[PDB]
Symmetry: D2
Subunit: 121 residues, 4 copies
Amino acid sequence: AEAGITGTWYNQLGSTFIVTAGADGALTGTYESAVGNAESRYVLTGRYDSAPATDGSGTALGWTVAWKNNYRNAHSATTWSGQYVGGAEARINTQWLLTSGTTEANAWKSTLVGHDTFTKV
Amino acid sequence: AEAGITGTWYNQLGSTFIVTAGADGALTGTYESAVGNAESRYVLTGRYDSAPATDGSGTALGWTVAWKNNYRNAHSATTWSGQYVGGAEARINTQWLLTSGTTEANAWKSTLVGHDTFTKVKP
Amino acid sequence: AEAGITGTWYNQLGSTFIVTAGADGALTGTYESAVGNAESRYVLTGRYDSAPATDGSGTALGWTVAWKNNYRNAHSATTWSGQYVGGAEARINTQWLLTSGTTEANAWKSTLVGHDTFTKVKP
Amino acid sequence: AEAGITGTWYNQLGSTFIVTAGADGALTGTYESAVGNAESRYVLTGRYDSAPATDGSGTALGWTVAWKNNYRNAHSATTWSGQYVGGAEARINTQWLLTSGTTEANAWKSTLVGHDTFTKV
Ligand SMILES: [Cl-]
Ligand SMILES: [Cl-]
Ligand SMILES: [Cl-]
Ligand SMILES: [Cl-]
Ligand SMILES: [N+]
Ligand SMILES: [N+]
């Protein structure tokens, strides 16, 4: 819990997430997706709540990735919100929101929602 | 545009968002919330997509706030996903997810969803 | 209250919702949308929780619309989840999920989320 | 696809869903949950899109359950949106919204979001 977040994680789609959790709640790393208008690693930044409760709970965290890198600009950003749980098999369970930049005309259809489970396997 | 996003913003609940959009697509600042087990400012970090399109599309962005500071710890974190629309009345329209740390058993009810609109006042 | 919900309602996009709240907690009616691969009325079915609280809480409800009628088929369905707030200006505030049928491969991008507010005009 | 929706399904939590899909898009049945202020079966009603595409896609559908029965009234309603996919192992993959009736003061925190995968196993 708290700790253990640092490392390389993978989700059901094959995307890889490499993060560093800092003593004071920062989350920094890079994201390589398996889907979308993605081509390479993207920078990610987030926060995690460094003093989780001392009961059998997971650690809340969230992060963002703007899908723009030296290779692609998909004019969109994804944020994942979820919680980290450790143990023999640690995972991060998240729900995400992906918003694309649209014209007002298409604003009603700008956000996709999904879920992802990351493991270090 | 980074500038365009930089500034002080408020939403309909009365929360304050102070942000700096940096060259490299980063977003840093503090969030003051009007609701929840919150007290004072909290640090936020996000990213925004620095090269939007010409046209009249919004700039997609997103940021996270873990509700822990030196005064409180709510054991939860919210991420806001949305777009910035500039003009005379610049607005950031978002959808957010708030997750609380829970035991595996109550995990099914760990995330809330909602939407917020922010109006800019200062740079 | 069933009555209270029964009526003609419009949201900010210009879509029409005609509903009948029945005794047994059911919701039946037609939806006319202003956006999407939609043409004409579609059938909706939902439920609402017939015994709310006294107090000034909203009545939780929800309904589904599969976007297929005799004129079009969009292979998608939307569910709206929210609450009814009565008074002189009765409103139904919702959050919706729109899922499109896709291949397993593009399933990750099958659902859109958003929010709608409905204003009542007729019973 | 289209067909096959009728039957008894179960989700990862143990909730049971029994539905009847009608030739014209109606979904009717009852829901027995494993979690919440639930006590027994609840009536559910929904719709499904009866003419799915003739390509390897799933069938879109959605349904609602107001958590009020002769035994409990949890002043809330849940709607599930997702798609049915058949094959040797058929499943219904959904994302749900659960709204409780609150005072305006608490309206900002009235909706929970999650996901559920139902199988006939
Ligand atoms: Cl991904
Ligand atoms: Cl807020
Ligand atoms: Cl609509
Ligand atoms: Cl359930
Ligand atoms: N993703
Ligand atoms: N559920």
